[PDB]
């Protein structure tokens, strides 16, 4: 039997993995940051309220100019908002109302969205005809889209329900790189700040660090109990934090290859739908489904503050690139911008 | 006080608001229906009765009422990660092949699917229409093949009506919260016309309950 001794080799190699990353944990991040003074109480007010959607929204994404944000919902619309004046600059009708993710291009020329229809449709905002229209539809991916993210105007990575992330080329319309290796279906995705590599999170309770060029998984990060729903890099690009159904946020390091800190409390038992970091990375913002957001001190693992404006599940959140504001969207059809 | 271009951007946003309000009034008056059930259980037969790659949309109108039917069984993943997208549906059309009682425990996994959908936290008030498909092939199959091989605890006659009523009592005894939701059960053949009438009669009670909820009467 080649088969049984092949898992004997795999179990020995995974034991070598656990021993190697056990040998690097000399002192935890709690022991390093006892000297650091805490952040104090973070109290953020609702500066804006974007009330245009008529159903549950599932995603938002900030633009790179920190003023335009897109938000997608189940009434077949994704609306681009002026965050400063609460103006709707576009309302794009969708071919399928079931949309679970949306993304904004870093150039600002494109938005992408996709859901249960298996297709990440890409919309051209800067048309000479004056209306937005479908640029390309990216099909052949056999599962619900969980997160689309642009690398530039031509590269886009998706994550699916068929346990598979894929890098696409928009002009040819064909997927160029296929990222397989996850066992349950991938739910979230986060690009690194240089966009040279990315992480994805699945229902394996496992996060995997990928590589865009060579196309193969480098590191695999375990430690969660239930399914991880959200993931986000630290702004250095050397760390990332995940969120799951455990009421735990855990952050990992790409160099140290393991856990660094767990963000949990006894009062919180519900799942985590969205994570993001601040601009300095000092505080991470987790969006829950006990209807509010918790501000976690990312170094000292303390609850800095609560963002409690929503009356349903906080489904999506994101921080601006200049770090001024936090917009949180939720299943009560309202976007709120916090500062 | 705004500038001229800020004023024109404000009136553009107000026209976008009027279009969104009009489309929401369009979408709020349409009945959404969720098809569930296993494959080869007469799902496509029911689609051809209402009419004549992840999610399949079906649009049909009947007695001045617009229906959208979402066949979602074409795409296969973990169902718990997207079944909350279908809360707020008007009704769930579940369908079970009656002639799959002997084939392979296929009736038992169909019961497990109805047990998972019917006692889900997102469908705690949704009324489930339970079609029972291929009753004629069931009635030739029960005279030759017994129904005790599906149900070891069954004791009853091998006629159509008592055995079909036994399968009805099982499927209506899957649910726990009897008070919250309603289950409408129908026996359908391949060639019958009354199924879209039965769906309409089941939808009208949900329409009455939401018309009371819109008028604050609960």
């Amino acid at each position, epitope marked *: 039997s080649e088969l049984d001794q092949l898992r004997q080799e795999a179990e020995q190699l995974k034991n070598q993995i656990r021993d190697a990353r056990k040998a690097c944990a000399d002192a935890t991040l709690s022991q390093i940051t006892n000297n650091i003074d805490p952040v104090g109480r973070i109290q953020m007010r609702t500066r804006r309220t974007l009330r245009g959607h008529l159903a549950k929204i599932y995603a938002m994404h900030w633009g790179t100019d920190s003023r335009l944000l897109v938000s997608a919902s189940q009434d077949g619309k994704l609306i681009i908002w002026d965050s400063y004046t609460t103006n709707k600059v576009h309302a794009i009708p969708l071919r399928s109302s079931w949309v679970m993710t949306c993304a904004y291009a870093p150039s600002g020329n494109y938005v992408a969205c996709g859901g249960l229809d298996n297709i990440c449709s890409i919309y051209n905002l800067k048309t000479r005809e*004056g209306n937005v229209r479908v640029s390309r539809e990216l099909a052949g991916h056999t599962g619900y889209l969980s997160c689309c993210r642009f690398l530039d105007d031509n590269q886009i990575v998706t994550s699916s329900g068929d346990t598979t992330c894929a890098l696409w080329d928009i002009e040819t319309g064909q997927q160029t790189t296929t990222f397989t290796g996850h066992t349950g279906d991938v739910m979230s995705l986060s690009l690194a700040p240089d966009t040279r590599l990315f992480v994805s999170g699945a229902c394996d309770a496992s996060a995997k660090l990928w590589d865009v060029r060579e196309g193969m998984c480098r590191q695999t990060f375990t430690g969660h109990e239930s399914d991880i729903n959200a993931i986000c890099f630290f702004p250095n690009g050397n760390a990332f934090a995940t969120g799951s159904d455990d009421a735990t946020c855990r952050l990992f390091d790409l160099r140290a290859d393991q856990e660094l800190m767990t963000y949990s409390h006894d009062n919180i038992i519900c799942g985590i739908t969205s994570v993001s970091f601040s601009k300095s990375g000092r505080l991470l913002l987790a969006g829950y489904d006990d209807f509010n957001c918790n501000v976690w001190d990312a170094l000292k693992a303390d609850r800095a503050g609560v963002l409690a404006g929503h009356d349903n599940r906080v489904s999506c959140l994101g921080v601006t690139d200049d770090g001024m504001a936090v917009a949180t969207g939720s299943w009560d059809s309202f976007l709120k911008i916090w500062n | 006080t705004l500038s*001229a271009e800020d004023k024109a951007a404000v009136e*553009r946003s107000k026209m976008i608001d009027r279009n969104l309000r009009e489309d929401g009034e369009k979408a709020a008056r349409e009945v959404k229906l969720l098809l569930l059930g296993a494959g080869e259980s007469g799902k496509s037969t029911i689609v051809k009765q209402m009419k004549i790659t992840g999610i399949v949309e079906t649009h049909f109108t009947f007695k001045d009422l617009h229906f959208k039917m979402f066949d979602v069984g074409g795409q296969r993943s973990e169902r718990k990660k997207w079944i909350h997208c279908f809360e707020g549906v008007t009704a769930i059309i579940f369908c079970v092949a009656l002639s799959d009682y002997d084939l392979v425990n296929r009736m038992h996994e169909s019961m497990k699917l109805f047990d998972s959908i019917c006692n889900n936290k997102w469908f705690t008030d949704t009324s489930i229409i339970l079609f029972l498909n291929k009753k004629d092939l069931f009635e030739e199959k029960i005279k030759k093949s017994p129904l005790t091989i599906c149900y070891p605890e069954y004791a009853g006659s091998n006629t159509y009506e008592e055995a079909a009523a036994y399968i009805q009592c099982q499927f209506e005894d899957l649910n726990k919260r009897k008070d919250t939701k309603e289950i409408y059960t129908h026996f359908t053949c391949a060639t019958d016309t009354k199924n879209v009438q039965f769906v309409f009669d089941a939808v009208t009670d949900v329409i009455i309950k939401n018309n009371l909820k819109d008028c604050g009467l609960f």
Partner: single-chain antibody
Amino acid sequence: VQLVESGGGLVQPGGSRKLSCSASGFAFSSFGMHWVRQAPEKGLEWVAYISSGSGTIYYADTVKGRFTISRDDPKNTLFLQMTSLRSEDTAMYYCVRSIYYYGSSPFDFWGQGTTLTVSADIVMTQATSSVPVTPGESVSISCRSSKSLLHSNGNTYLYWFLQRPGQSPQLLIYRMSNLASGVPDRFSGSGSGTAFTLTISRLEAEDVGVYYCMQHLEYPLTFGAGTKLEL
């Protein structure tokens, strides 16, 4: 895209005439439309404006009461009903599309023009009426505003246009700093409150024509008299 003017000709004074602008190739109901005229040896003069959905209509004060702008969205046609035509209404009339959201570029496309012959504002001052221009050399023109165009939101509502000889004008620089689409990066705009500069470094051929600067801070919109580039 295409905007086609029609309805000109010789009109007796005191008479009436309806001008028509037929749109083609763009989503016409999402666009605010303008009429801008040009007296046959003079500069550009703004006439009227109708917004999207016909909810906001402005006129110039020289034509207020006499002119009626109206649009018909299902057949994509812009109208200008003109009554009691005077001899100062002998001009060539352009219909202009313009859309206003965050980051939009209004006054981007202009119609070809119809020619009709009749038998407290912000004053924009072009500094020179004509400059001698050598090809290849850099040139830089300027105009000045009577009021500071820098609004409190950070925007400066200064638009630059170029009219080639015998052609419609086209947008070069919108909102003092931003290049229009299809315009080369030789053109550059710079300035401050009420003092503005359009720079054409490494001038090529077919940059030759009259250049107009326009404010869009307040209605009515006022142009300059035009700076002519001559070889």
